[PDB]
Structures are given as structure tokens and as C-alpha cells.
Amino acid sequence: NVKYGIVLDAGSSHTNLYIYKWPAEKENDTGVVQQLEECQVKGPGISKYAQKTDEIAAYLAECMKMSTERIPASKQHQTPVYLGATAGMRLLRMESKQSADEVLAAVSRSLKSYPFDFQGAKIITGQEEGAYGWITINYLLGRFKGSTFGALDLGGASTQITFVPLNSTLEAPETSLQFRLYGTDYTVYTHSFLCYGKDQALWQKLAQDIQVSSGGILKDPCFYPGYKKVVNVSELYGTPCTKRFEKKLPFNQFQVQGTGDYEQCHQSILKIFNNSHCPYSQCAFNGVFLPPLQGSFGAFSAFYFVMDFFKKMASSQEKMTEITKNFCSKPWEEVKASYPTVKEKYLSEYCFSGTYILSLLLQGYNFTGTSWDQIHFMGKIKDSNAGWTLGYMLNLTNM
Amino acid sequence: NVKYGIVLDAGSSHTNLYIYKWPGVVQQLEECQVKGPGISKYAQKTDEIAAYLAECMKMSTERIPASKQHQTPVYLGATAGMRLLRMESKQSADEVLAAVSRSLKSYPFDFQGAKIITGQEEGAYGWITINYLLGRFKGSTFGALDLGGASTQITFVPLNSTLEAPETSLQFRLYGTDYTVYTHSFLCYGKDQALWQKLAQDIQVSSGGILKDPCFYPGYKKVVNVSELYGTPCTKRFEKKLPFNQFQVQGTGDYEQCHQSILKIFNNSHCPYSQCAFNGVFLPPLQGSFGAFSAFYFVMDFFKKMANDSVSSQEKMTEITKNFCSKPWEEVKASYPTVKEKYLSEYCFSGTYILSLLLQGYNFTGTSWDQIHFMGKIKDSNAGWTLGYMLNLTNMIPAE
Ligand SMILES: [Cl-]
Ligand SMILES: [Cl-]
Ligand SMILES: [Cl-]
Ligand SMILES: [Cl-]
Ligand SMILES: [Cl-]
Ligand SMILES: [Cl-]
Ligand SMILES: [Cl-]
Ligand SMILES: [Cl-]
Ligand SMILES: [Cl-]
Ligand SMILES: [Cl-]
Ligand SMILES: [Cl-]
Ligand SMILES: [Cl-]
Ligand code: NA
């Protein structure tokens, strides 16, 4: 009859549980996997539990109950549950392999305690995360019966780019991934840039820019005029991503003061990217190989959530740069009063995140001019989230 | 009573044919090295494959009793040379596999296929070979380090069986015991491709068709054809437009400039893992003893014959190489008159390369250096992947 599968996406911002369902896989047809329900776990990402793994159980309980409430009891024992953690957990592992392991063991312990078929709790690789997102979107776009779309994924901690290039090379064979799907072997370029998700990029920029001299203030063009937020230096330096900028600071804490200038914001962003070393034909940034761009792209996760916000304010690069520039210069009190339904944690970041997305796509990946139009921003296709989890489910269902 | 099987290892530098025999009991009966380069050099010369294979196949027919030839399987497994050719041209690689197949099938044995084996197979099979030969299967196992002309592999059982990149991971059961083995093959990091990466990286429009190179002896010369240098996928990343067709490498024998030039072909800047080998590839912490074979052995053996015929500290191996690199090419030839110059001319490079790969690549520094055992043969059978491949493909490996 119907079959179910649960995938937890343990990302750096939040954990999300996904329930998938599909016709039981008979010989007299084939049918599709689709997203049935999603739950967002209340709280931060799992890495924030490193020193309190005894609370992991409780942390996951509400969304796990949704799943036992939602999936019929007679279908539960045979339903797989998997948790994949991403860049937040890769950073925690860099800090301390043991913390990461103690986090993941408490997750297994919790998940194993449910009536579902535990399939594992792992930190997935950057290449897997990228490939699986490319699988999700091409599957949902029906492309697996011709050319495929590239996949751009942006999160809090990392960003991925995955596409089939014109020419397959040994330029950086650790950037290639070959796999078979519906009788076709595929060879994709895929890379995850750790620390270049939107939140880690902001920590890098702040660490880069903070002055010993400042008396505990950082004027910052990436936030609205009148915006103020106090930053703990210990938190700022509590990520591997800012290690290269660490300095002794004569203060424990500092206030960010918005100055709302898109152009200065752009310039300040460009500074956490290195373009000076490329041991290949051409590169993205930080000496990482990138093949020439090819085909159309789906951009999702924070690419979508941030772009769609700016689009709803109006779709060329020139038009999007204008909307962003104007929005950046709007005072923070005006911004909150104009978007009063939006969580201030997201609203406070849109200037920064929009300018960052534009820098990443245009300077990082070279989607300039002609190429800008080859990017399609997407959240759901056929009602399933674009993301890695559906492709993970497809492959874990031996599809 | 006797049973035989044949495996041709079609590597980048040579094809080697091995006859195995048996009733840990399988044994190499004889090896034959096929004269000439690797099969991928026959890409436009596929009519010549038959003649190329003839001597070693004739050997095999002379050695195995005719009474036994028909139940004797024959396999060819080709490695990183043919992986590169498949990249350069899937067509060519396929015509070579076709020409090899036709030829092998003309012999009176059980023909069982010619195929390009994967990097993981190549690695796992090497590790199986050395532990089967060492009787570590009847316990701790040895790690395997393999170096050829075109790729290098590192395979071992890590302390933690949950690897950070399960793409580097294999899980299997051998003779009663469950194993999780880390394995990785680094294409283009065999000793010959590494030299071409380095020369392609170092040649400049300003070179005026002369490249002074510290990894070759004073007085040594070698002509490098540009279109050949750029005919490997391994140099594509360094290609540039050059106003000459060929250039001459002129040795200046300086170990430490050699070492530095070498380091420049590895990327060590980004590692999203706890630790890496190079080029962002995960490597677990090293553990236990390792056997280092193929070109690790033949190169190292030449050097330890300068070190009281024993691999000594990294410090002493380094010093030995350093001294050796300085010696003029006439002197080096005069001091080793029995050694083929094609090998002799490459020892300063290959030795410096192997030390960098092991010490900075695979992180065998300090304390860990002592646990590498360089070995050619174990109990009269070659360390390599071919015996492990044979054992599995004849399902002669039990789970209990
Ligand atoms: Cl996290
Ligand atoms: Cl992320
Ligand atoms: Cl983050
Ligand atoms: Cl390219
Ligand atoms: Cl609103
Ligand atoms: Cl709020
Ligand atoms: Cl070859
Ligand atoms: Cl090789
Ligand atoms: Cl080679
Ligand atoms: Cl000389
Ligand atoms: Cl000699
Ligand atoms: Cl000679
Ligand atoms: Na290393």
C-alpha cells in the first residue's frame, strides 16, 4: 500500500523532520516519493547541545510525536528514520571530535527508542549534501527521463554548488562525484564551501572588521541605519570560521551599529573571499576549482528564502541590486514597522544576506550578465522542499 | 592436487602477468613482466596488443599443464593508466580493452574479462593481499601503501569504524571477522604523473625551451614534448600557451628546492575534516603497521642500500637523498652501472617524492615513520592487488 520514511535534517540553524510517503513499490507500476509533512524542531541546531546531550531526547520529542501520531501504527516498525547533520556539526567536529560523537550517540539513543526502523545518525559529507540536493531538484523537475539543472544550496554554515559541466576533467577529481540513477551513470562537479553559509560569512566579516581601537563599537554598512546589536567576542571567536581573524581585543563584547550602505557592504563582503591563488584553469574563490558554468540552476534554501523576500518587494541582476541597495538604506525602525510580522532575527539580516547572495553568485560563481537568468530560485517543487533530504530518501529506499 | 589462475595487472608503466597456484595457501607460481609500456600506450596501436602479450602468454601456456589450461581463469585488471585514457577518450580505452580481450581469448584458458578496476578495488585488494600473505587473517592487520606511475593508494582499518567520509569506507567479513577499512586512491599522484604535474606547473613562457630542475642530477638532460606533457588529464590544470614545442630539463640536483617544487602540486589549504591527506580528502588518524609496496619498495630499496641496508630515520633517509641528488649524472651512471638509466635518472625525484607523500601527504611524520615496512615479496609472492583480486573473484574468501 503506502510506505513512509522519516529524514531529519540537522542543519546549523534548526533541525527539520521530514516525513515522506510513496506507493509501495509493486511490479505493475512505478510511483513517486513525496513530502507528506514537515516539522521544525524548536531551538537551535543540535551542535548547541554539545554540553547537554542529556537534553537531546527532549529536544527531538515534539517532532518525533508528530511522526508517531501521523504514521499509522501498523506501518511504523517498517518505516526508516535517518538523521543527517551538515556544516554546523562539521564545525563542531573540527572543534572537538568527542563532542560531535557524544551528540550523535545521544541522537541515536533517542531515535532508537521510537517504533521506527533506525537507519542511522551521521554527519553527511559536503559532496553528499550537494549531490543529494541535485538529486532532489532534478527528480522533482522530472529530469531523470536530456539535461539536468545545477543546484545552489545556501545555509547558515556552508554553501554548495553542484552541476554536470560541459567537459568532465581530472582538474580536481576530488570535486567529481559519479553515481547511477535509473540506468544512467552521472558525473557531477560538486563542492561545499565550509564557513561560507550566510551566518558564518557574517561572523567572518565581523571578525575581520572589528577594531581593537573602537571602544567596543563596530559601524557596519551591512545593517540598517540605526540598527544596534551587541556581540559577545567569545561567541564570535567560538567558531573555526573566524580563527584566521582572531586578535586580542580589549573588550569582551561590542555593539554593531548599522550604517546602511549597500556598496560599502558589498566591498566589505568581498574581503572575506580570497581570489589570489588558483592552481587550476579557473576557480570560485579560495583557490577552489570551478568548471565553467553550464545550463540552468535551481537555487534553494536560503537562496530562495532571501531572494523571494526581495522579489516580493518588487527580476534582473540590475533590478535586484537596486532593491537591495534601497532596502539597506532604510532605517531599522522603519524596516520593523514595514514588516511587522517578520521575526527580527531574520529581518535584521536581509540587507547583509541579500548583498552576500549577490556577491557569492556574481563574483564567487560568475553568474554575471547572460548567466543571471539561468538561476531559478525555488523553495518547493510539486510540493516537496527543495533540499538534500528527498534525494537521501530516494537513495535510502533503493530507488 | 593443483589449481592455477592468471591475472594480468595492466598498470601505467608495465603489464605484469601473475600465475597463482593452490590445492592462507594460494601462492604465486611465476610472474612475467610484459616488455614495453602500459596498455594505454597502445591507444592508436591496438593491432600491436596481440604481439605485446605473446611472450607472457606463451610462458603461461608452457607452465600450466595442458591437462589444466581450460579450468584456469584469466583476468586482466587495468588501473590508473587506463582510468586516464578513459578520461582522455572513452573510445580509445574501449578499443584497448577490446584488443586485449580478443587476444586473451585466443589462448586456451577460461577467459574471464578485461576491465578497468576502481581505485577502491585496487586499494582493498592490495590490503587483502598483504594480510593474506602475512597470515594476519588466521588479530591486528597491516595498512597498505601502493604507489604506481599514475595513482597512489592508502588502505587500513582505522581505530574508529565510523569514518567521516563513508565514501572512503568499505565494510566486509573475512574469515570470521568484520572489517571497516578506509581506502583512497589519489589519481595523478603516482610518481610519473606527479612529475608531469610538476614540470607542467614549472614550465613558463619565459623558459625559452629550457627548464632548470632541482630534482634531477647536475649534467642530466631530458627532452619533454609539450603536446605530450599536455596529453595527460593530470596536467590540464597547469596548461598554458607556450612558444616552443619541446623543452629540455636540465638537472641542478638540489634536494630541498626539489622538495619545495614537489609540495607545490599538493593542495593542503582546506580540510573540512578532523584531518586530511591532501586536496581536502579525509584521512583518519594512522594506526598500526603498514606495508609499502610497488614503487614505494623499488625506490626505497635503492636508497636503503645506501643506509646500511635498512630504512633508517626519516632524518637519515632525507640526508641520503640530499647527498644523492647532488651527484653529477656521469658519476651516478658510473656508480650504478647495472641499473637501467630510465630508473636511475628518476631516483632523486622519486625519492624526494616518496618522502613528501609519506611524510606530509599521508602524515607519517615523526613517531609514525617506523611503522612502515617496505616490502616487495612476502613468502615469495608479490605484494600488490592481484592476489586479493584473484582470491575474491574465485570466491575463495570465506566470511567464517
Ligand atoms: Cl548544528
Ligand atoms: Cl548550512
Ligand atoms: Cl551557522
Ligand atoms: Cl576547466
Ligand atoms: Cl510583515
Ligand atoms: Cl521578533
Ligand atoms: Cl596503461
Ligand atoms: Cl599506477
Ligand atoms: Cl603514468
Ligand atoms: Cl655529468
Ligand atoms: Cl649497479
Ligand atoms: Cl640502460
Ligand atoms: Na597531510
With CB atoms and an 8 Å threshold, state whether A286 touches B270. yes
Closest CA of chain B from A243, distance in Å? 13
Identify the helix (H) or strand (E) that includes residue B329.
Answer: helix B329-335
The CA-atom distances, in angstroms, between A170 and each of A186, A318, B95 are 15, 36, 21
Closest CA of chain B from A168, distance in Å? 8
Identify the helix (H) or strand (E) that includes residue A299.
Answer: strand A297-301
The CA-atom distances, in angstroms, between A231 and each of A257, A351, B214 are 11, 18, 52
- Whether residue A339 lies within 8 A of chain B, CB to CB, comes out as no
Q: Tell me if residue A358 falls in helix, strand or coil.
A: helix
* Cβ–Cβ < 8 Å for A156, A196: no
Complete DSSP assignment for A188-245: EEEEEEET-SHHHHHHHHHHHH--GGGSSEEEETTS-TT-EEEEEHHHHTTSGGGGGG
A127 chain-B contacts, CB cut-off 8 A: 167
Looking at residue B284, what DSSP letter applies?
P
With CB atoms and an 8 Å threshold, state whether A94 touches B274. yes
Q: Greatest CA separation found in chain A?
A: 73
CATH 3.30.420.150, domain A125-382, yes or no? yes
With CB atoms and an 8 Å threshold, state whether B87 touches A168. yes
Pairing of strands A176-181, A150-154: unpaired
Beta strands in B11-147 (DSSP E): 15-22, 27-33, 73-78, 110-116, 143-147
B269 chain-A contacts, CB cut-off 8 A: 277, 286-287
For residue A157, the chain B residue with the least C-alpha distance is: B272
Side chain identity, residue B115: K
Q: Which of A62, A60, A67 is nearest to A18 (CA)?
A: A67
Give the closest ligand to the alpha carbon of residue A154: 2
Cell of A267: 566591498
Dihedral sign (CA A43, A49, A52, A58): positive
B201 chain-A contacts, CB cut-off 8 A: 279
| Burial class of residue B400, CB neighbours in 10 A (0-12, 13-18, 19+) | exposed
Give the closest ligand to the alpha carbon of residue A344: 6
* Residue B177 CB neighbours (<10 A): 12
Bridge partner residues of B182 (DSSP): B156, B169
Closest CA of chain B from A223, distance in Å? 30
- Whether residue A174 lies within 8 A of chain B, CB to CB, comes out as yes
CATH number of A1-124+383-399: 3.30.420.40
* Cβ–Cβ < 8 Å for A113, A64: no
Q: Which of A354, A266, A374 is nearest to A309 (CA)?
A: A354
A173 chain-B contacts, CB cut-off 8 A: 187-188
With CB atoms and an 8 Å threshold, state whether B87 touches A169. yes
Identify the helix (H) or strand (E) that includes residue B83.
Answer: helix B80-88
CA A66 – CA A83 distance, rounded (Å): 16
* Cβ–Cβ < 8 Å for B182, B153: no
The length of chain B in residues reads 400
The correct CATH number of B118-379 out of 3.30.420.150, 3.30.70.120, 3.30.70.1400, 3.30.450.40 is 3.30.420.150
Domain boundaries, chain B: 1-117+380-400, 118-379
CA A367 – CA A363 distance, rounded (Å): 7
* Cβ–Cβ < 8 Å for B262, B352: yes
Q: Tell me if residue B381 falls in helix, strand or coil.
A: strand
- Whether residue A243 lies within 8 A of chain B, CB to CB, comes out as no
CA B396 – CA A96 distance, rounded (Å): 43
Closest CA of chain A from B283, distance in Å? 13
Residues with CB under 5 A from ligand 8 (ion): B 12, 80, 148-151, 190
Query: Is it true that B1-117+380-400 and B118-379 share their CATH fold?
Result: yes
- Whether residue A282 lies within 8 A of chain B, CB to CB, comes out as no
With CB atoms and an 8 Å threshold, state whether B87 touches A279. no
φ/ψ of residue B302, rounded to 5: -65, -45
CA A159 – CA A134 distance, rounded (Å): 13
- Whether residue A112 lies within 8 A of chain B, CB to CB, comes out as no
For residue A92, the chain B residue with the least C-alpha distance is: B274
Beta strands in chain B (DSSP E): 3-10, 15-22, 27-33, 73-78, 110-116, 143-147, 151-156, 169-174, 177-187, 210-213, 221-225, 246-251, 290-294, 372-374, 377-378, 381-382
CA A34 – CA A22 distance, rounded (Å): 6
Identify the helix (H) or strand (E) that includes residue A184.
Answer: strand A184-194
Cell of B322: 640530499
We find that the CATH architecture of domain B1-117+380-400 is 2-Layer Sandwich (3.30)
Spacing, Cα A288 to ligand 4 middle (Å): 12
Spacing, Cα B378 to ligand 12 middle (Å): 28
* Residue B205 CB neighbours (<10 A): 10
B55 is catalytic: no
Active site (catalytic) residues of A: 129
A94 chain-B contacts, CB cut-off 8 A: 272-274
* Cβ–Cβ < 8 Å for A120, A82: yes
A interface test, pick of B267, B271, B276, B278 with most A CB neighbours within 10 Å: B267
CA B332 – CA B326 distance, rounded (Å): 10
Count of A-B CB contacts under 8 Å: 57
* Residue B142 CB neighbours (<10 A): 25
* Cβ–Cβ < 8 Å for B69, B3: no
Cell of A181: 540513477
